[PDB]
Every structure is written in C-alpha cells, then in structure tokens.
Design a protein around this nucleic acid. Sequence first.
RNA 1: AUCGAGAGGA
DNA 2: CGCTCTGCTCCTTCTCCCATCCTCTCGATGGCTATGAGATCAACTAG
DNA 3: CTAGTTGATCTCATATCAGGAGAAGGAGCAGAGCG
Lengths: 62, 82, 171, 62, 57, 101
Amino acid sequence: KHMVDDKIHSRARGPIQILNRQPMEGRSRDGGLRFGEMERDCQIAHGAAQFLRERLFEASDP
Amino acid sequence: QANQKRITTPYMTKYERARVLGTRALQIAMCAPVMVELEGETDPLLIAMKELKARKIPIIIRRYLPDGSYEDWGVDELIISD
Amino acid sequence: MFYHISLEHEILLHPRYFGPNLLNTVKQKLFTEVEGTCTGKYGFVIAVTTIDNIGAGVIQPGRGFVLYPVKYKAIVFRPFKGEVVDAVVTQVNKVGLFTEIGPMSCFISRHSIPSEMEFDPNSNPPCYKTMDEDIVIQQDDEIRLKIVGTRVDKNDIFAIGSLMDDYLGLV
Amino acid sequence: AIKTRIISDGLKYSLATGNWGDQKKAHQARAGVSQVLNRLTFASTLSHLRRLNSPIGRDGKL
Amino acid sequence: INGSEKVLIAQEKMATNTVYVFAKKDSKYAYTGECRSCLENSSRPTSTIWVSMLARG
Amino acid sequence: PVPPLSVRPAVVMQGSARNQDDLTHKLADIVKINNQLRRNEQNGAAAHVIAEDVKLLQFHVATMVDNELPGLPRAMQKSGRPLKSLKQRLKGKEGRVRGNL
RNA sequence: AUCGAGAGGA
DNA sequence: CGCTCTGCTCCTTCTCCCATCCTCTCGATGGCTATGAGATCAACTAG
DNA sequence: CTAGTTGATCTCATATCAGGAGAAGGAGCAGAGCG
C-alpha cells in the first residue's frame, strides 16, 4: 500500500495552527515537518546557531 | 584588555569562517561594495569566499572571554585554514 | 533655556553605505535624524553641536544592517515652571494673547492677565490697553512673561505663560 | 418506562468507538476492542478477524 | 455500525476459579496464591481472593 | 488572573457553533462559583453552605492550574473527558516547552 | 475544525 | 532519674519519568443559558 | 426652534495483574548527657 505519491510532501509558508502560530501537522493539513528536540541537539553539536534560530524561530513562529 | 597581548588563537575558527562568510555574503547581496576584483561572479557566497581568500573582508570578530572581556581580531589578522 | 548637553543614540546603517566614506554617512544621517527633532524629556533640540564618539559598529546577525552608537553634543531648549523669559507678541485676540518664545508659541488667557489691560478690538491694531492707556501690548511687541505650564503634543512642546507677577510687563 | 436508547445506543457506541464500557466512564473504559475491519487485502481481513490481544499495556517493558 | 465494519478482537485474561500460586520477589509476601473467582453465570466482576505467606523477617 | 483569548481560542467548527477552550469552561465554573459564593456571603447562607462553596471554588482553581491532584476527582467536561489544565499544557512531551519551543 | 482512539511506516 | 534531644532505621506516601519522526481512518463534539417594560438619548422625520 | 417616532442601550424584575526509582515525613526507638 505504501506508494511514494501518498507520502511525498513539501511546505513553504502554508497554514498555521491557531493556538501556537506554528505550521500544521500532516500532509492532509499542508503541515510542516517537526524540527524536534533531537534535531535541535544535532544542530547544537554542529554549532549552527543561525540555522538553529532559523528553524526554531524564523521558519516556525516569528 | 590589552590589544598588544591577545590570548585567543591566531586562527579563524570554523564557526568564525562560517559566520563571517555568511555575513559578508548578505552584505554583498544588499549592495555593499566588493573589496576584491570580480571576473563574472554574481553569487554573494562566491564573492565572500573570494574576499576571504584575498583577506579583504571588512569585518572585525569580537571574541568574548569567559571573564567578560573581549578581543577584537580583523579577518585579515587571523589565519584562514579552510 | 539654552543649554549644551551630551546625548546618546544608536542608528542602523544599510550595507550600501559602507563604501569608501562611512563615518561621514553616519554623521550626516544623525544630523538628518535629530536636527529639528523634539523630545518631551530633553525638550526641543535647536541643533547638534559636535559629534564626540562613534562606537564600534555591530553587525546584527540575520540582518545586513550595522548599528552605530553615537555620542553627540547638542543644544536643547527646555521651558520650566516659574521661569521668567522675554517673549515677542504675535497675535492679539479676545480669547487670549499669543507670543512666540523661539520655536514655541504660548497663549495667555485674559483670566491670567491682570484685569487692568482691557480688550480693544475697535483699535486698528488689536491691542491691550489699560484705563490710562499708558502700557500698550500689541502685535510684534517685546514683553516679559513667567512660564507656568508645559504640554507636549506629537512630541512637540507648547508652553503657557502668565503676566500677573509683578515687574512682568512691556520691555 | 422502557427508554430503549440505553441498550441500543450503548452497544452501538461501544462497538463504534472501541471504548469497552459505559460512555460516561470513557477513561476507565478499555479501548482497542472493536476495531475497524481491515479491508486492504483478503489476508488482512482474515487475520483481523482471527486477531487476539494481550491487554498487558504497550507501555510495559517487561 | 453506522456503515463501518467493526471487528471484535479477542481479549486475553487470566482464567477464573483457578488457584495460582506465584511469588513476587519485591513484596512483603513470600508466596501468594490468588483465585479470581466468578460465578458460573456472570453477574459481578471477578472477585479476587489472595492467600499469602508473610516473608521470613 | 484570567488569560487572554489567544491562550484559550474559541475555535469555530464547520458550522457556526463556536467551541470554547477547556480553560474557558473552567473559568466559567470558577466565575459561577465565585459569584455564587459572593451572593451567599452577601445574603442569607449557612456557615456550612459557605464552607462547601469555598471548597468547590478551591477545587475549581486547583484543577484549572493542575488537574491531576491525587485522590481528588478530575475536573470533568462533556463526553466524559477530563479538562486539560495549564499544567498539562506544558507538563512534558507535547507541551509548550518540549513540544513547541 | 478540534480532540481522543485505533491501525500502520521507518 | 526522668526528661530532653537527638539521630538511625523502616515504612509510607508522593511525585516524576517512561525514543524520534511520519501516514491514515473513525467517533464525538452538540451546548444550548430568554423577555419584556421602562427610561434615556440621539437622530431623523416631519412640523 | 418643536414634537414625535424610532432605534439602540441599559436597568430591572419576574421563579424553583507484568513500574520503578528517588526524595520527604513520620514514627518507633536506642541511647547519651544531664538536670
């Protein structure tokens, strides 16, 4: 059942949630992908502070 | 802090290189004058790397020390490795 | 009151202005910014006298701008409660009398003025005159006043003055 | 006196949601009973109809 | 139910009316014999009765 | 302190029925019992009645900021689901700090 | 739309 | 010689935590919380 | 200017089981000084 066309998804400034003005959840909601705690830790290890700020501040909910 | 004696490394860190290149590329993209000559480069990142190789980026890195003081290094004063 | 004070400001600068001449651009931008400006706390700034120091310009991360903190000597004008100043009369009216103190224009109501100085709209120049008609306060006259109240509107100060106190009259 | 909605709506709700118990006790009730039949392939349907469940709790790591 | 095909999953449970002697390592009792008792035609939940031995000391 | 509408948005459903947040329902209970206690202290009420009202107000405020109090009954709502208090909004995973910051 | 639950993927 | 002040142990609460990201379906959710008389007032709609 | 009508706004009034692990309090108590 797992065809790629039912899984491919992309986002660039779509809809946002009401409570926290962050991207929605899911392909069906045209949502954004979660940049989670482990991604934050990985980018902290990388030392990429501006990319980390872009992902956790500017690309989510400025 | 005595600029005659700066205790930090004379090398540019990988993070300093990254942020200096990004900053200067944004400055070039916002129509700042270029310090080096240009053959056909139109990408700000390429121009910034050419300026760094030429040692002609007009930026000062203010490295903070844990005690609270700081040391100002010109991008031309640091040793660029990569 | 004329004064000479050192003041602090910080101004952003676009990357286009880096150029071979940079300090001059920050200087002239400061001038074009705070020349003729007005603030209620430091009063009105007549002009900027001399630029003392130009701090290190810090590049804001994520933004091409650079903020320069500038220290500059500028001369201000601040009216005060209880201060006496000579003013120039500009308009006479039945609602009150309008006199200009430098950039500010202050209005004095007939209630604050002593009752001796009558209205006189029938005179060819609108003027204030007493029973004896000795003192004459009309347009363009030079008269002393005491500044009682200050009010700031749209960052612009407008004062109010009184002529009741003794020795406050025509120059 | 007989309000038939008790038995009808109770059985219908319990089979519809899977929360096995009274509708008011929606948290004391144990879910996962009465799942939607899998109709993706005949083997999935047969296996779902022959499915057993050990309600030990997935959280348990024993 | 409401046009939706619902399948009841068989649910496992410990058998009733049988005595099961276990021994919990971390407990005040050395051995515990439990019996989840339930009348033939169910009318109440399973009434569990335990008969335990207190741990030595 | 009753938070603003952003913290407890009233989301509109497919139709016109505006559904209120759990915080708003809880604040409704708090205001109800607060007004009830205010009138019962102002007008005729027994001491034990006022005591019961104060106990219920305490329960409502506590379950507004923290619903999982041991022993006490969980603040309920329609459909038999407990309300999500301010503590569960940011308690752990999928809360504000870990789930949104 | 929300919430919950369930079924799944790596 | 009877009281105090420990401070050790056993039990008891009590409270916190339990991988990451992702897809889909399915059921419930309702929440509804009036009414009108009087006075006030400010704007037209006429005079 | 003068009434008069018409909305809006607001006040008022009517009713009766296969967790775990650690941290904190409390209690029982053995014992040491010591009044």
